[PDB]
Amino acid sequence: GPLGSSAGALLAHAASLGVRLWVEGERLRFQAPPGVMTPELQSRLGGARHELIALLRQLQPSSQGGSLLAPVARNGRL
Amino acid sequence: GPLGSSAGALLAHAASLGVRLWVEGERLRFQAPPGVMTPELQSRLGGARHELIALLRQLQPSSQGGSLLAPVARNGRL
């Protein structure tokens, strides 16, 4: 598989697989497809706050104004 | 008939599969074997405090005196 540098690779593969962890009230809810949640992957996740916060940031549907960038210039040459 | 509140099946299968969730400092750590963490099983867990506390209770190696029952060296109620 791809190793990458570190953060971007982790962020990319976690978002792509759809590993979302969010705290809801008293209990943390985990979104993990069958097979990807292998113990070593969890070690890749690291269980750290900053990236996990970004993992929810992927799902954020709240649309509280500052939701996503929305550049609109997605094309224009490439 | 179904009584409710008391979920022996939930406790048994969660312990058997080795599903453990514990809050460590800031971050809840999840122990989930690949394949068993299917979303519907998470729904079976319910994500509630009481049963999950028991899910840690199975792992408790702290040996703080009141660890387990140990029905050995004593014949029932003596």
Q: Which one of A28, A31, A34 has the shortest CB-CB distance to B28?
A: A28
Identify the CA nearest to A28 among candidates B32, B7, B55, B23.
B23
Query: What distance in Å separates the CA atoms of residue B30 and residue A42, rounded to the nearest whole number?
Result: 9
Method: NMR
The answer as to whether A77 is a domain residue is: no
The answer as to whether B19 is a domain residue is: yes
What residues have CB less than 8 Å from B34, skipping those under 6 apart?
A34, A35, A36, A37, A38, A39
Other Cβ atoms less than 10 A from the Cβ of B76: the count is 5
And the tokens for B71? 């029905």
For residue B29, what is the nearest residue in chain A, using CA coordinates? A47
Contacts of A25 in chain B (CB under 8 A): none
Count up the domains in chain A and report the number: 1
What residues have CB less than 8 Å from B40, skipping those under 6 apart?
none
Query: What distance in Å separates the CA atoms of residue B30 and residue B20, rounded to the nearest whole number?
Result: 6
The answer as to whether A1 is a domain residue is: no
The answer as to whether A38 is a domain residue is: yes
Domain of residue A53, CATH code: 1.10.10.1830
Structural domain boundaries enclosing A34: 6-60
User: Which residues of B make CB contacts under 8 Å with A?
Assistant: 21, 23, 26-30, 32-35, 37-39, 42, 47-49, 52
